Design a protein around this ligand. Structure first.
Ligand SMILES: *C(=O)[C@H]([C@@H](C)O)[C@H]1CC(SCCNC=N)=C(C(=O)O)N1
Length: 493
């Protein structure tokens, strides 16, 4: 009517290596002044036909808007398409240069990147989180009519390079989908983090969607599971309980706990081990055998406050600071005083709720010699100092224990990575809905990458983390380490 905005070119989103992920592409939008269109009714049917619109629906739309001075006819046409309609010389019909987003990697990085709405505003993912950086500033065209000027130029948005490595993202996406098909699972997540920089190198969820064509789309495919699915992490948090034990000054890895007969009565409750073939276990054995009894006895000795503190410091149930739309925090209840039942359940991971992103970040702190670096979804050039949350001595010790969980007899052999020493822990998460988990990092002797694999479980009162998720970790870690040119560390001493 008086002012019409001049859309600004929205900033390009690339992966960390400059591969295109969200591109602002010029498109031609047609608009009309219904007051002038109302004087040329005989041209409407050819215009409706050129637009592929029903003659009656098109005429009713003009008639109902007869007193308006601006209505869109069609948005997002190619420059070639706009020219053909303009050549008809229909009174009151005008072409406007607009920008429309295209997502070259499509479904492979759908949830991380997100998308823009009809007006080119960030709606999901990075598009929304970094909307101010990406959007730039629109210009203005003053239109004066009976009873055109450029006022303020358009400024383009800014390019953004994500932390995601499209090569690792594609490998993760492919392997997670393979694993889901193999096990008859319908949903899952896989997160890969650079332990040194806090960068999220890959974040894939299944099911996924093509952001280039969002009509039809089931809302389950829209779910950014890695950041929104909250669950009790179970056995995957035992390394944090062990970190508290080694930091207490009361436990060395060679110390023994008698877990026989794989049950422990605490008043009215019975703590039970899934695998009940042990008597004395050292601290590494407690992790290899995933003994709830062993971890609970240690937890009683050191107190739940020490375990709570380690979990809180590594970020379990805490804000990530990413500012990512829809990201959930979960909950790590600070009971202040914990009875035995609550102490045990916390120690073996059923007394808190976390996300896959949080679990990966906690494993990244352990892998990075106990130093937590803040999470980033954008490329990190200057690494922040981070915080020493676990002492380097304790983190080094727990790293060795987790390498034994993968490599020792009776360990999670399916998680072994050929050419490298790998470390990690399997578990069954609870939401009752279940998930099979594997969390770990590699190379075990000089860690570079941390990864969490979550596969949603149809299940039957079973524990499949070491069967379903561990092989995904093996394949994705091997490919990721090779893609990053990490030297193999399993060499003759
Ligand atoms: C952890 O998630 C549970 C805990 C809460 O009971 C455990 C039980 C099992 S399965 C038997 C493993 N024993 C030795 N080979 C696991 C696991 O995934 O290893 N975690």
């Amino acid at each position: 009517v008086r002012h019409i905005a001049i859309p600004a070119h929205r900033g390009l989103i690339t992966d960390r290596n400059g591969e295109p992920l969200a591109v602002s592409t010029p498109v031609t939008t047609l608009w009309a002044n219904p007051k002038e269109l109302m004087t040329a009714k005989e041209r409407w049917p050819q215009l409706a036909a050129a637009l592929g619109q029903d003659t009656k629906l098109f005429a009713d739309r003009i008639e109902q808007n007869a007193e308006r001075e601006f209505i869109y006819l069609v948005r997002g046409l190619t420059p070639e398409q706009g020219e053909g309609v303009i050549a008809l010389k229909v009174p009151g019909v005008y072409s406007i240069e607009e920008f429309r987003r295209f997502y070259p990697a499509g479904e492979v990085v759908a949830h991380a990147v997100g998308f823009t709405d009809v007006d080119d505003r960030g709606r999901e993912g990075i598009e929304l989180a970094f909307d101010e950086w990406l959007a730039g500033v629109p210009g203005k065209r003053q239109v004066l009519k009976d009873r055109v000027q450029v006022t303020k130029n358009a400024k383009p948005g800014k390019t953004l390079a994500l932390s995601i490595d499209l090569r690792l993202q594609y490998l993760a996406h492919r392997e997670l989908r393979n694993a889901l098909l193999e096990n008859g699972a319908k949903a899952g997540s896989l997160v890969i983090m650079d332990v040194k920089t806090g960068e999220i190198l890959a974040m894939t969820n299944q099911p996924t969607y093509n952001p280039n064509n969002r009509r039809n789309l089931q809302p389950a495919a829209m779910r950014n599971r890695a950041m929104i699915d909250v669950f009790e992490p179970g056995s995957t948090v035992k390394p944090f309980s062990m970190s508290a034990a080694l930091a207490s000054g009361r436990w060395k890895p060679s110390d023994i706990v008698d877990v026989y007969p794989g049950t422990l009565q605490i008043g009215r409750y019975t703590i039970r081990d899934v695998s009940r073939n042990s008597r004395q276990l050292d601290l590494t054995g407690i992790l290899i055998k995933s003994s709830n009894v062993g971890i609970s006895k240690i937890a009683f000795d050191i107190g739940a406050e020490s375990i709570y503190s380690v979990m809180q410091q590594v970020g379990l149930g805490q804000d990530t600071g990413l500012g990512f739309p829809g990201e959930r925090v979960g909950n790590l209840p600070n009971h202040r005083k914990w009875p035995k039942a609550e102490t045990a359940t916390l120690a073996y991971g059923y007394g808190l709720s976390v996300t896959a992103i949080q679990l990966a970040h906690a494993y990244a702190a352990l892998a990075n010699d106990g130093k937590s670096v803040p999470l980033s979804m954008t490329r990190v050039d200057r690494v922040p100092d981070g915080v020493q949350v676990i002492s380097p001595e304790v983190a080094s010790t727990v790293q060795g224990m987790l390498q034994q969980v993968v490599e020792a007899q009776g360990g999670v052999f399916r998680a072994q990575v050929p050419g490298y020493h790998a470390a990690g822990k399997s578990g069954t998460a609870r939401k009752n809905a279940y998930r099979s988990l594997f969390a770990g990092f590699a190379p075990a002797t000089d860690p570079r990458i941390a990864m969490v694999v979550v596969i949603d479980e149809p299940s039957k009162a079973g524990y499949f983390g070491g069967l379903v998720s561990a092989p995904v970790f093996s394949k994705v870690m091997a490919g990721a380490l090779r893609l990053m040119n990490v030297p193999p560390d399993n060499l003759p001493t």
